């Protein structure tokens, strides 16, 4: 047969990455994907799967595959896993307990940090309740943290809910930027995302 290559390079080798609060989702369909040239890459700091081994995935077909990409701190990548809590997992990106997929991350200090601070990567600091799995929140309403209510203005108990990381190349490895890619293997529709093993 003849098929397009799944555009994973557009996801992993992108020069620009989204903020975790506004995490970008790419829906991949009608293509062939070699999931072990990904796994067998020296690129990644993190490559854990919660469904089936990458070797087993080049056997199966899926109707849709999602590539969620964003940037967080090093010591925050542990939150991108089922049953984790923290500012990122609670307020920015939440995986379900029944997560079927893989979480991939690598250090991007050489590209996402600059002297003086890279303020373009943000994460949600405040929220009334936790996010549900795979929900996205791009709201920017003033969050009232104290007794006083604010009428849309930033106060001492009333914050802008987003927070810049301030990535610098001199930061510690835990405070350095890491790019994350979450692949979710959905099976609903025609299964047109497959591996090269059939």
């Amino acid at each position, epitope marked *: 047969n003849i098929t397009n290559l799944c555009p994973f390079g557009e996801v992993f080798n992108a020069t620009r990455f989204a903020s975790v609060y506004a995490w970008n989702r790419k829906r991949i369909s009608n293509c062939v994907a070699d999931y072990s040239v990904l796994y067998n890459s020296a690129s990644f700091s993190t490559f854990k799967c919660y469904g089936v081994s990458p070797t087993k995935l080049n056997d199966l077909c899926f109707t849709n595959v999602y590539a969620d990409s964003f940037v967080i701190r090093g010591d925050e990548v542990r939150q991108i896993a089922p049953g984790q809590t923290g500012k990122i997992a609670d307020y920015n990106y939440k995986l379900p307990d029944d997560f079927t997929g893989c979480v991939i991350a690598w250090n991007s200090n050489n590209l996402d940090s600059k002297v003086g*601070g890279n*303020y373009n990567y*943000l994460y949600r600091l405040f929220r009334k309740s936790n996010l549900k799995p795979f929900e996205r929140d791009i709201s920017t309403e003033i969050y009232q943290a104290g007794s006083t209510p604010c009428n849309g203005v930033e106060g*001492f108990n009333c*914050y*802008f809910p*987003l927070q810049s990381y*301030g990535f*610098q190349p001199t930061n510690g490895v835990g405070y350095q930027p890491y790019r994350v890619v979450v692949l979710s293997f959905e099976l609903l529709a025609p299964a047109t995302v497959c591996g090269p093993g059939s």
Partner: nanobody
Amino acid sequence: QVQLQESGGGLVQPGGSLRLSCAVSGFTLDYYAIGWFRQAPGKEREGVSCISSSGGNTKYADSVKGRFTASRDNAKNTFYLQMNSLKPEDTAVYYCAAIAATYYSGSYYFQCPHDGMDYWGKGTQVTVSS
């Protein structure tokens, strides 16, 4: 990485005053915010003051407003907190903390949210007693 060295504080009678200093060393950001927090016995740590790296955008809890003034040295990376008309309820350990400013849609925000602060000082004791 930046480090914060607190200085000042100690024991004072009701009605007295104090001045806390916090020296900021290391690779500072172009735009950041310095916050003063305090933790009293039997209570959670509370924010007291917040100031920009410029010296402006000062905010205070309504419990020290009018009595405390945060400021910045104009030739040094040291941030001051002048505390006037001290009362026994002001007795606490005072902490200096640094955080990055938030840049969004072409606008800077200088906040000092407790859970967001990136660097903390060791803290200094402040006792207001008779």
